[PDB]
């Protein structure tokens with residue numbers, strides 16, 4: 180099992196909310212992603228349960244990040260969607276068979292499990308060391324300084340006005 | 343996100359093969375772990391296809407490592423069993439919806455995909471930097487010098503004697 184499809188979506192969602200820098204209603208995010216408002220709202224639940232997004236009420240209400248983009252790491256978003264479980268799971272096969280390691284000697288993790296855990300720690304360190312602010316800065320530098328502001332304006336234009 | 347159960351088994355198999363002075367039949371490895379020969383054989387065929395173990399014929403035939411333990415990395419074993427696919431797959435969601443990035447502006451990978459790719463590279467680099475010889479050295483240090491030789495002796499004892 181690799182990462183679920185929700186990780187790609189949730190990372191893009193955090194970048195687009197930073198671009199808006201004002202509450203974005205479910206309907207406007209849903210239009211941007213070409214899905215229904217009710218489907219978008221269901222996907223947002225992973226980010227709201229993790230305390231990364233909240234809902235603002237009122238006529239120009241909608242979703243906002245709960246803290247600045249520099250305080251949201253890629254690891255925060257990945258764990259919001261796919262949870263905290265490591266990729267490698269030790270099933271304690273060293274406790275099997277006629278030369279089984281007795282449980283009283285199985286307090287410390289298997290050296291194999293520890294090496295796999297150290298590799299996972301490098302993956303998590305890389306995700307923890309990168310922020311939503313870094314992604315926004317790279318999009319700015321490569322798409323131009325007008326690209327994300329354009330997305331932000333499109334999301335919030337006309338909110339609280341009836342045409 | 344999960345690595346298949348075969349990774350744990352294949353890493354243990356590589357470690358115990360270092361302790362054997364002769365080819366080890368799949369049947370003896372299976373007996374040591376009190377596990378189905380057919381399950382063990384599938385993990386050993388994955389290691390064989392990756393060029394990490396080979397089958398020796400004759401009366402005391404069985405599996406041997408194809409090269410020294412110091413030349414076999416955790417990455418070699420993980421990819422032999424779970425394949426080369428990364429954790430994160432970009433589905434080009436930036437090409438969706440009314441503000442879709444046109445193909446001509448999709449010459450570079452998405453910055454989000456590149457950040458996830460950098461984390462994957464950190465994971466692979468950690469697995470590539472640890473060898474079966476490192477695992478053996480750690481087992482010798484923590485289980486004592488007699489642990490692996492005990493397993494090695496058990497695996498090869500009596501082969502070709504018919505008691």
Ligand code: FES
Nearest residue numbers: 269272273289292
């Ligand atoms: S007993 Fe699970 S990795 Fe060794």
Ligand code: FES
Nearest residue numbers: 432435436452455
């Ligand atoms: S389009 Fe796939 S990670 Fe951005």
